[PDB]
From a paper:
Though it lacks typical virulence factors such as hyphal development, C. glabrata contains a remarkably large and diverse set of putative wall adhesins that is crucial for its success as pathogen. C. glabrata wall adhesins are large, modular glycosylphosphatidylinositol (GPI)-modified proteins. The N-terminal region of mature GPI cell wall proteins (GPI-CWPs)–also referred to as A-region–is believed to define the ligand-binding function.
The [name]-A crystals belong to space group P43212 with two molecules per asymmetric unit and diffracted to a resolution of 1.85 Å. The [name]-A structure was solved by MR using the Awp3b-A structure as template, followed by 20 cycles of model building in ARP/wARP. Structural similarity between the A-regions of [name] and Awp3b is evident from a calculated root mean square deviation (RMSD) of 1.36 Å for 223 Cα positions. Additionally, [name]-A has a truncated turn comprising only PB3-T3 at the N-terminus (β0: S18-P24). Another feature of striking regularity can be observed along the PB1 sheet of the [name]-A β-helix. In a +2 position, a second outer stack consisting of four Thr and four Asn, interrupted by an isoleucine residue, stretches along the whole PB1 sheet. The four asparagine side chains (χ1 ~-63°, χ2 ~-53°) resemble the interior Asn stack by forming a hydrogen bonding network between the side chains’ carboxamide groups. The A-regions of the [name] and Awp3 subclusters are almost all predicted to be heavily O-glycosylated at the α-crystallin domain and the following cysteine-comprising stretch ([name]: 8 sites; Awp3b: 16 Sites), but not along the β-helix domain.
Author numbering: 18 to 324
């Protein structure tokens, strides 16, 4: 219905009850509320949508509700320059279908936790062969360790077909609540901690940067592929009385608390250098005893396992 065929810039709050097809570039400025209630189609790859929150205002909402559908082969940027402990934002991407073969970038200046913000990616169906980014354009410090403003991906019982890349590079923490699938996908934890509380975790590789962490709140039956493991990061597993073992032939790290967690970290690690310790983590406002594994060594030069 609404077709953007020439570079367009719109001002103020926007509520799209029509299907929106963008083949050029659409820019949304000076609005505290951007709503796409039906189709939002961005194609071909050179097309783009950029939603800029109104500056120096209290609340910001970007919404793709369950009535909507997202089909992006170009570039969708959601940017909010508002920052500070009183910031309230609601970036709620919950379309019936979320199909991305291009780039989606969440670019926020308010990345600290708070009491009231929501950052949600939880459609019914999730399809990503491109790149989804969460980046910071702020400089906030002194996080209050609250439960709001934590990017939460998926939900219990729904799946996420991640054939491409999810880049997490903005905040102290992120939550993965849905079931990831597809063998080619990667989740890159470039800053902060990733907490996983999901029914299963299939196919993807979790790549940890330095001074990041992966924490599984509940064990999954799948072996979880994690790469980048070295003295700069850790894998945490919820539960008390933690023990662990590393198999040099398969490259699999097995952690046992009250449940069994299995991580494929690669071959080449020396198990005699590894150690573990009990700590306490916070997840969705509750404290959990957690067993941490520190490999205490660099990434091996060759991660391949013997046949």
């Amino acid at each position: 219905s609404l077709d953007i065929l020439t570079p367009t810039t719109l001002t103020g709050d926007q509520t799209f009850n029509e299907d929106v097809s963008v083949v050029s570039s659409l820019t949304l400025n000076d609005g505290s509320q951007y709503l796409f209630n039906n189709l939002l189609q961005i194609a071909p790859s050179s097309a783009s949508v950029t939603a800029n929150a109104l500056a120096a205002v209290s609340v910001f909402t970007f919404s793709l509700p369950p009535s909507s559908s997202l089909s992006n082969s170009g570039t969708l940027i959601i940017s909010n320059s508002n920052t500070g402990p009183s910031t309230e934002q609601h970036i709620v991407i919950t379309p019936n279908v979320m199909a991305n073969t291009g780039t989606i970038t969440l670019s926020l200046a308010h990345t600290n936790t708070d009491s009231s913000s929501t950052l949600i990616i939880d459609p019914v169906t999730f399809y990503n062969t491109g790149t989804i980014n969460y980046e910071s354009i702020g400089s906030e410090t002194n996080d209050p360790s609250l439960t709001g403003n934590i990017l939460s991906i998926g939900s219990s019982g729904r799946t996420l077909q991640n054939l491409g890349t999810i880049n997490l590079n903005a905040a102290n923490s992120y939550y993965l609540l849905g079931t990831i699938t597809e063998n080619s996908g990667s989740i890159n934890v470039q800053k902060g901690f990733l907490y996983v509380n999901a029914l299963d975790f299939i196919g993807n590789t979790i790549n940890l940067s330095t001074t990041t962490a992966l924490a599984f709140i509940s064990p999954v039956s799948q072996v979880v592929r994690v790469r980048g493991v070295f003295f700069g990061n850790i894998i945490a597993s919820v539960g008390s009385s933690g023990t662990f073992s590393y198999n040099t032939q398969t490259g699999i790290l097995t952690v046992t608390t009250n449940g069994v967690y299995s991580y494929d970290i690669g071959c080449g690690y020396n198990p005699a250098l590894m150690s573990g310790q009990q700590e306490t983590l916070s997840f969705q406002g509750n404290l959990y005893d957690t067993f941490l594994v520190l490999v205490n060594q660099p990434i091996p030069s060759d991660l391949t396992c013997a046949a």
